[PDB]
Symmetry: C3
Subunit: 265 residues, 3 copies
């Protein structure tokens, strides 16, 4: 009796077809332009990061492959490159008239984030030498899986999965923010306002994904606007972050007095 096809519901792209959202035309000029812009931004950021890292000769300017033997510094590059590949799929799907198996790369919403967000969290926590560097990465991965199930499934299980992922993300993100603030309250030793604004806005960009999902679900924001905003948030979250960290963890052993093991909060 159990089956994957409930005959009381409709299905389409990405799983359950919400009866209140109209069909989203993936072949609109706005969508093609925005996807091209996102792919170009991510690929350019990845190439520039790779050039700036591999070309670094070390603090004393004699160590070829200085970053090659210190792999944790390259963790940013992958986060961009994988994203670029995902966006490349979108471009391919438009050359195929947004048709057939080519859509499979981005068929399920938030699935592409499974291979990026955990690595971004891991690199952010490793760069600042913070505790629970992988535990929170796994928690973010489970959040992404919860979101994938939520967007794929029918209303009841969809909302239950959303709630599960929401508490997991809330706990992990509050913990990460407290750790990062504790670490950065030592750096302060003009920079204060810009640093605080950058930190709070970077946290807000992450917090804005579930807000966008909720706005899209109940017909507040249109699907086209949601797509454009999602592309902008992905670019802002991934491209800048690596460049911001590049001028910070270059030519260091990552065990300085500033970045020693966190003590007393």
């Amino acid at each position: 009796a159990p089956s994957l096809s409930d005959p009381n519901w409709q299905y389409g792209m990405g799983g359950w077809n919400n009866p209140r959202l109209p069909n989203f035309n993936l072949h609109d000029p706005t969508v093609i332009g925005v996807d091209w812009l996102g792919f170009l931004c991510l690929l350019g950021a990845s190439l520039a990061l790779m050039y700036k890292l591999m070309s670094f000769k070390g603090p004393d300017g004699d160590q070829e492959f200085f970053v090659g033997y210190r792999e944790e510094k390259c963790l940013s590059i992958y986060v961009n490159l994988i994203a670029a590949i995902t966006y490349w799929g979108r471009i391919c799907a438009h050359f195929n008239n947004d048709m057939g198996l080519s859509l499979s790369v981005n068929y399920f919403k938030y699935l592409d984030y499974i291979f990026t967000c955990p690595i971004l969290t891991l690199d952010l926590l490793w760069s600042l030498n913070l505790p629970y560097k992988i535990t929170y990465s796994l928690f973010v991965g489970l959040t992404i899986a919860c979101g994938v199930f939520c967007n794929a499934f029918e209303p009841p299980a969809r909302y239950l999965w959303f709630m599960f992922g929401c508490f997991i993300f809330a706990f992990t993100w509050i913990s990460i923010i407290r750790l990062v603030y504790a670490r950065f309250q030592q750096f302060l030793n003009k920079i204060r306002a810009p640093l605080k604004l950058s930190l709070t806005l970077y946290f807000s960009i992450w917090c804005g994904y579930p807000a966008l999902w909720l706005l899209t679900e109940f017909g507040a924001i249109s699907q086209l606007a949601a797509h454009v905003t999602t592309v902008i948030m992905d670019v802002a979250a991934k491209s800048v972050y690596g460049f911001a960290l590049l001028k910070f963890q270059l030519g260091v052993d990552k065990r300085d007095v500033w970045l020693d093991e966190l003590k007393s909060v």
Copy 2:
């Protein structure tokens, strides 16, 4: 000519439909109750482990994030949490009348074990400082993949995959048991009978999965009884294990004389 739909066989939930097993009603009160109990047990165990670990301040009571900078101690928590998420899916599938895409979380038998058993084996071998700590984890993962293919496929390939996974598991488990006995014959220095009973019964719980599959396949044990027994075995294998290890590897560097590199068997 090749196709994924052999017209000489029937198909249903989880792949091939055995013509000798009746359809298993996933919407039975017993199944809902047992799945709720399993989810509650796994989630409670995960939360209690997380609280007891993150709250540990170190041997001298001055190291906040003592476990945060020693990640290998948290490897237990993930094993539970992932399991809980899997069980959460079951609960979601019952709120959706055991219908539609919601079943996809537990569509394929033993697939959920792919992300838990390797981590459990890795943590068990790392805690006791034993050799081949990852090789046996990968072997267990390949065993889980073999079981997934076995349950998914039609009789001939099903039995061949079962046989392959069976020898892999036999070799890996005998090796692990010999290593664990060699390590624990030093600890003995009242505890002997309880420790031996706990160790042998924990090994028996792992050994009982293929036995349950064989009993279910040939109509000895009913599918409902198999489901209840599988839930009990999962709880026993995962919830207790972490709590048992918690009072052992707390506030240590994991390189003591007892847990030095194994020598002479």
Copy 3:
């Protein structure tokens, strides 16, 4: 309007059905024999590597589990074993008349390579102590994913994915070859011609995969010949490599003067 089924194209095994290639009879005696030979070769190589590694007692002949506590030496074994499992699936699919769900193990071309090539690259770069040991592993993985999408999708997106994977592989492989030549120009201190021939032919075997795909795509080489050549290339690339490295990185700490961190190219 978007759907995974473009009605202007045909579909079959592995995704898009090329209208210029005839249906490939997977139940031909040549295919069964070649798959059996490949499975036997990979499994025998894995078993012999495992026996020769686990049985090593260390440089001074007193360290049981010498390789067990030095895991990076076993990275070869997994590369073979996983491959064997994949080939096992093929054998299973022939016992099921090349029918039904059993084909799912090898439904998508190059998907099986996702879990082998990255590990092979990682082990090769780690054994010689070379930089970017994981970055190039991830690049090879993304190349394999690009190839999977290329073979799965319809002509336009297929060729675009092929081009993307082709540049990624070109960059990564030229970088790896330059690093390996730089490392091995120190070893030279009769061996020169055999070593150079082995190195260049091993690189050529890797370079020959996209060449085989291009030859198959445009009806130059027949599908049966492509299958046999692919099996031979897999055996040559995986079985020999581990045995070649076995007599090199046995009973060493992997930080000798020859294998110190690469300097000045």
